Paper text:
E. coli cytolysin A (ClyA), also known as hemolysin (HlyE) or silent hemolysin A (SheA), belongs to the α-PFT class. ClyA is a 34 kDa soluble monomer, containing mainly α-helices with only one β-tongue that transforms into α-helical elements in the pore complexes. Each protomer in the ClyA pore complexes is composed of five α-helices, namely αA1, αB, αC, αF, and αG. Here we report the cryo-EM structures of ClyA pore complexes in the presence of n-Dodecyl-β-D-Maltoside (DDM) as dodecamer, tridecamer, and tetradecamer at the resolution of 2.8 Å, 3.2 Å and 4.3 Å, respectively.
The crystal structure of the ClyA pore complex was previously solved as a dodecamer at 3.3 Å. The EM density map of the dodecamer presented here is at 2.8 Å, representing an improved density and structure model. One typical example is the side chain of Y196 from αF, which is buried in the membrane. With the cryo-EM density map, we were able to re-assign the side chain in parallel to, rather than pointing toward the hydrophobic membrane environment. One protomer from the dodecamer (Prot_12) was superimposed to a protomer from the crystal structure (Prot_cry). Based on the comparison, it is obvious that the binding of mercury atoms pushes away the C-terminus of the αG helix with a movement distance of 4.6 Å at the Cα of R291. This represents an artificial distortion of the local structure by heavy atoms, although the overall fold is not affected. Based on the particle numbers of total particles and those used in final 3D reconstructions, the majority of the complexes were 12-meric, representing approximately 80% of all particles, while only 11% were 13-meric. The inner diameters near the extracellular edge of the pore are 70, 72 and 77 Å for the dodecamer, the tridecamer, and the tetradecamer, respectively.
Residue numbers in the entry:
A (entry chain A): 34 to 87
B (entry chain B): 142 to 292
């Protein structure tokens, strides 16, 4: 008369979706953070080399 | 650069999983109340004495001991989350200060290397009394003395 098991299955299935996409998006945004910092190091080194030659 | 991206990936997962645990808590408290007050209604195999002796035990143990203990455990999880967020926020400042120190020293060394290369080219005129080379050497003496005074 009180469907508690279907309620728990629904809550856990809505809660697994969010865990999956958080774990997927966080790794990719951290990778983009690493790439942007690497690009800023390469930019600094190139413009400093040309500055010292000039 | 790799650790500074791992740190962002940890911080975002931390802030999402804390909210999912905070919703798990509220869905679990209602399950405890459902089980307790549904099992206490089976004290009708005796009279109303058996009914009050079941609802008193249920509403005493669940509302007086179990739910405040779960709330204290959740408050502990909240304080842990705040401490770990401050740890990540301090690690970012340490990494940024180290990188700024290194790039400032690269620029300061390049200011010496430019004068050294200019003097090395002025030597190639094969004239040691050339005023341009004398002035470049007098400039390098002051540059090297200022670098030794700074370190």
């Amino acid at each position: 008369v009180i469907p508690w098991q279907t309620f728990d299955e629904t809550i856990k299935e809505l809660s697994r979706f969010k865990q999956e996409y958080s774990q997927a998006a966080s790794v990719l945004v951290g990778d983009i953070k690493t790439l942007l910092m690497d690009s800023q190091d390469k930019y600094f080194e190139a413009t400093q080399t040309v500055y010292e030659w000039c | 650069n790799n650790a500074s991206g791992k740190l962002l990936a940890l911080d975002s997962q931390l802030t999402n999983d804390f909210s999912e645990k905070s919703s798990y808590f509220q869905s679990q408290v209602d399950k405890i109340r459902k089980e307790a007050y549904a099992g206490a209604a089976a004290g009708v195999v005796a009279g109303p004495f058996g009914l009050i002796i079941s609802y008193s035990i249920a509403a005493g143990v669940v509302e007086g001991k179990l739910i405040p203990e779960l709330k204290n455990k959740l408050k502990s999880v909240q304080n842990f989350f705040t401490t770990l967020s401050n740890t990540v926020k301090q690690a970012n400042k340490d990494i940024d200060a180290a990188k700024l120190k290194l790039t400032t020293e690269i620029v300061a060394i390049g200011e010496i290397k430019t004068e050294t290369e200019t003097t090395r080219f002025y030597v190639d005129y094969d004239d040691l009394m050339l005023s341009l080379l004398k002035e470049a050497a007098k400039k390098m003496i002051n540059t090297c003395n200022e670098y030794q005074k700074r370190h």
